[PDB]
Point group: D2
Chain length 108, copies 4
Amino acid sequence: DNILYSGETLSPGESLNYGPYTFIMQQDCNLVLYDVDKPIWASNTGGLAQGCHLSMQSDGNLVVYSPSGNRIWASNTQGENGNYVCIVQKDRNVVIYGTARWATGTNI
Amino acid sequence: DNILYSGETLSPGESLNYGPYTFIMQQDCNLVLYDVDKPIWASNTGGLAQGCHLSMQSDGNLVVYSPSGNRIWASNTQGENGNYVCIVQKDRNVVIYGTARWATGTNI
Amino acid sequence: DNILYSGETLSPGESLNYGPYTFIMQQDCNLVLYDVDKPIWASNTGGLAQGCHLSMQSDGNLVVYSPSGNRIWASNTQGENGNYVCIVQKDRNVVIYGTARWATGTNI
Amino acid sequence: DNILYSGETLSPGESLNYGPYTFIMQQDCNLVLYDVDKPIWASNTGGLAQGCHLSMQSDGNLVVYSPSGNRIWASNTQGENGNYVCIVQKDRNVVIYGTARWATGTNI
Ligand SMILES: OC[C@H]1O[C@@H](O)[C@@H](O)[C@@H](O)[C@@H]1O
Ligand SMILES: OC[C@H]1O[C@@H](O)[C@@H](O)[C@@H](O)[C@@H]1O
Ligand SMILES: OC[C@H]1O[C@@H](O)[C@@H](O)[C@@H](O)[C@@H]1O
Ligand SMILES: OC[C@H]1O[C@@H](O)[C@@H](O)[C@@H](O)[C@@H]1O
């Protein structure tokens, strides 16, 4: 609910949430962080397309894609292939972390 | 509740939780991942001391310390100084990620 | 979280949250349910005072109080004395339930 | 999550969770509240059947049913037809509340 894992996408209208904080891939292709109803950060890509999705990729890049498979905005954080996370944190920061350094190996 | 940030500690009896998954720093100094009442992973340090704390450090090492400030168990993942997270994931894996590659910079 | 128990208050600026839904006791004494940035319900008491708190009472009434201990808005649901909950639900309804009909009695 | 709404069921192996607290409809038809790995309350119906479901009914009764549609255990809280909730609370109590006294009417 507040974590996007590498290999997952937010569809249009979908969000990560922590308390009053919402990080949403809007239908107007703007990527916005709201504190209640106040925009605090945006990709500033509102109106460049419709029906965009947000991908957290295996190369560590967070990308807004238009439905033509066309890059609209990116974090520009391509690097090592592996596992990454994008988190809406309790401190209201949105952060990409990776690669994975250690695991219990208890996945299902 | 399912994330430990670098610079934070779990005190004795404290846990990270996702649904039926509990990752707990026990009073007997064992670090255990439970699926409901079933231990699925442990540090196997039960009885080596009392009143241990778990630290997620800035160097990326997850360490169980005894109250004498003495290292009892570690992930052995020291590297670059920065920001890391330890997550109890929805897939029941416990994972350390870092360093931070990008942020909105919207922290309070 | 998404539950206010009878005997608790939301202070000014505090909220109940479920995913993109935020139920906030605003600084301007308006009680508002937001879906992301869109107000979908309000007490319509914005500007009648400053520094109001929301109280879920053991008589089952949800009341906005001004700092003079003065009733500004209420659900008008006074009844049996007991335990009640106010919930921001997954279906985006905000509901008062009570009284308590049964419990395990496993409270701390 | 930590709420079961009237009209919903927990299937075998499914749980309500708050932090280290797990309320599970087990495969062995026992209904158990665990604090980490410690059972603190049970229906004591382990082994009376297999593949039971827990149902929070609109008559306010919480019932364990066997797959033959047969009552195995109940809270015995039948009353007014309406909307009820069963909650695993932050205080580690499991409580049934209802009926609904008030709502915003903002459901989807
Ligand atoms: O090695 C760690 C990785 O293991 C995978 O199976 C998943 O659980 C990933 O989320 C995780 O990053
Ligand atoms: O640069 C990213 C870092 O910024 C800090 O202020 C915190 O929000 C950290 O959790 C985060 O890793
Ligand atoms: O008996 C039910 C009541 O028990 C109390 O001690 C608390 O746990 C209340 O939240 C609950 O409604
Ligand atoms: O009127 C109250 C009821 O409204 C219904 O439509 C649902 O949202 C129920 O969960 C709720 O109890």
